[PDB]
Amino acid sequence: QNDLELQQFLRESHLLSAFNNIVYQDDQVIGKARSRTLEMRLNRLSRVNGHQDKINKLEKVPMHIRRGMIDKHVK
Amino acid sequence: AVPSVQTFGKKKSATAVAHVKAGKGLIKVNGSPITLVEPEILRFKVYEPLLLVGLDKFSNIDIRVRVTGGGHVSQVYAIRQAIAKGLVAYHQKYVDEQSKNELKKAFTSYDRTLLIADSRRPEPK
Amino acid sequence: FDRTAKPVPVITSEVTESLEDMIRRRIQDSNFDDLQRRTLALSEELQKAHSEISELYANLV
Amino acid sequence: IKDMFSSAMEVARFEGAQIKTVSGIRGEIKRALSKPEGHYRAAFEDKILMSDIVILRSW
Amino acid sequence: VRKLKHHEQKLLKKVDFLEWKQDQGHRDTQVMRTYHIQNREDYHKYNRICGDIRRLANKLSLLPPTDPFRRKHEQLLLDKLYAMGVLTTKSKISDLENKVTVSAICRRRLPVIMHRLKMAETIQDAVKFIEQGHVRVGPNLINDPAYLVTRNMEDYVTWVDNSKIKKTLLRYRNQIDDFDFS
Amino acid sequence: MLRRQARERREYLYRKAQELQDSQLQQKRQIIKQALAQGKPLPKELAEDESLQKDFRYDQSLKQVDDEYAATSGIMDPRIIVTTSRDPSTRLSQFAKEIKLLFPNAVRLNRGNYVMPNLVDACKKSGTTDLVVLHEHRGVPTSLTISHFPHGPTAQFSLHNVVMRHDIINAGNQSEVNPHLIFDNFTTALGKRVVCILKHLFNAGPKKDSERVITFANRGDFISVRQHVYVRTREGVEIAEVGPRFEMRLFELRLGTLENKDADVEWQLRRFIRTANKKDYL
Amino acid sequence: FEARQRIEEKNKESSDYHAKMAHIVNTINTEEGAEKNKYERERKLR
Description:
The structure is cut from a larger assembly and holds 7 protein chains of 7 kinds.
Chain C: H1 13-29, H2 44-60
Chain F: H1 2-37, H2 44-48, H3 51-54, H4 58-61, E1 80-84, H5 90-102, E2 106-109, H6 116-126, E3 130-137, E4 140-148, E5 154-159, H7 165-168, E6 180-184, H8 189-201, E7 212-219, E8 222-232, E9 237-254, E10 265-268
Parallel strand pairs in F: 1-2, 1-3, 6-7
Antiparallel strand pairs in F: 3-4, 4-5, 5-9, 7-8, 8-9, 9-10
Chain G: H1 2-45
């Protein structure tokens, strides 16, 4: 748990599979895996010390669109 | 209006403005006739833009100059540069281009620094 | 009374000698300072990304 | 500056020294003027005026 | 169209005839007004170039950081665009996707440069004097208001010779010299 | 070319002003590069901050000579002119000459009636990298300014305990080979700056065999300079001195050239401060 | 010569004095602050 990199690789296990269908190492990683996983780490580090609304604000989607998305997803 | 043309002459730190307007043929320098431009040895340095091109071209225009700055010899060289540029520039304006060419060939064959600035800009060797 | 400046230091045998021994040590060790006269595979998919971005960059430029 | 000192040997012994004017501006006293005997020149940090009195403390 | 009343506003919540969504804010019309540019297609050509630069910065960003190809290409593209003058500083490398704008390319255009150098009074007069034919860049003169002037040609943009606008400057400052026919 | 030089002055001053405005953004970008590497929480500022986090990919790609010299540090050997004040004296003409011999690639020049703007212009336009103008006091030289030309700094030094080679000893004549340089006890940031000006005034990347070193020893606010020739004996080094010995001392560092007289002032010696004498580089 | 002696002496005397006073102040804060924070830590309880 006090290690810094095994547990990081555990956390972005899923993105790597998703967007490279190995290169877990952060200096051969490429493409949308690189982009999304950087967004991941920054959100975690900022989440421990920022305020809840600004650390995760949601993008703006109109009502019937967002309700439709959540309904399809829950199914 | 009047037909009138202004030119400028320049040696070490002198300056000399010539207004040339069509008139009866007088030449004055700081409000005195040209025949008393002072250092009296170099009066013929001043007369040579007149006597290289004959007097009649100045019989029909009224050239009037003012100088300042510098010393004796520098004001002499500024006056004659301004007069020569004055006469050839008026000739291009208000008579023919051919006579502009003949004037400038006369002054350039004799002494090009009647027309261009003799700038001894330095040299680092 | 006071002064406003330490005055200039008179050059002595001791001062010269200190200076020489500095120089001698730096010249024995030869760590003396000069102005130096300057000079003048990957993976399949990284190679693919490079290729695309180079073609894209050539058209833009 | 004048009549603070009486001879150039005296000024020599005191030169390089601190000095200040009434108005607060500082200076040092630098070289003994030789041709009149008391004076010296001293270089202030701002333009001193004629209505001023330079001083030098000493214990 | 009539400042419609309350019951019908509630029913016609989405109508406007003037400002739609596909007109992105009339951004095009508005920057066109600002720099007095004359072709609809001018704004959208500049946007297609600006779009090229931005997708390229994005693909480079997706390559990994410790990668000398990426480092070389962004350093080289910044120095390209800065020499052209479309972005001002060469340090921050996010300026590719952040501060590269159709408005930046427009303000390197020719009339705006005259206006900035104070050869004009306003961009309408810089355009007007270009179009009447007083401005030159070096030996050859420009009739073309849409000319894009790299920094090193900003050194050379000047008045033409023997224009009446050049004579006015000189006659005012009282330095006409008619041997030049200035 | 006048309009060119002026335009890059205007630009570079601007782009430096930007630099002093983004040192703080430099610092906000360094924090994240620590915290991504070793997992540490971020402050509230960088936490809530989203401009920065949104464009921390590009700036993640981002990452010594002085800046005025960085453009041509190792490429081109300099060209120097060394010139006297105005109506010199016989002793000063000797001093100027042998300074010229001290620096390789220096050309002496006599000033009579060369007004200063014309001297700076003509050097700029001909392309000489820097200019050394020397001031006497009855034979003894007392000042020296050194100024670097494509709009770059001028250091003024005052110079003090002088002895001349030509007037002390005719044991021979100087090597005139690319010398070695020694810069001793220059520590503070201003000290680095003065190292940079003198070092780039010297010549090309000299050989390993050259038996002429030149020492610049900062001892207590006073820069001391000497020339030396040597040999390597089997037990040690035999150093024979040559060239003038004089304590130099810096006392002004303007940013324009030496005509300007209203350029900005990086460092100026202040004598009448309450704690003037206490420190060094003050 | 007397200038060198005077100035060098005076600077040394003032720097040593500064370090002396800082040592007194730092020790007072450290020891007594330990005592006062200990007393207040007790006091909040009872």
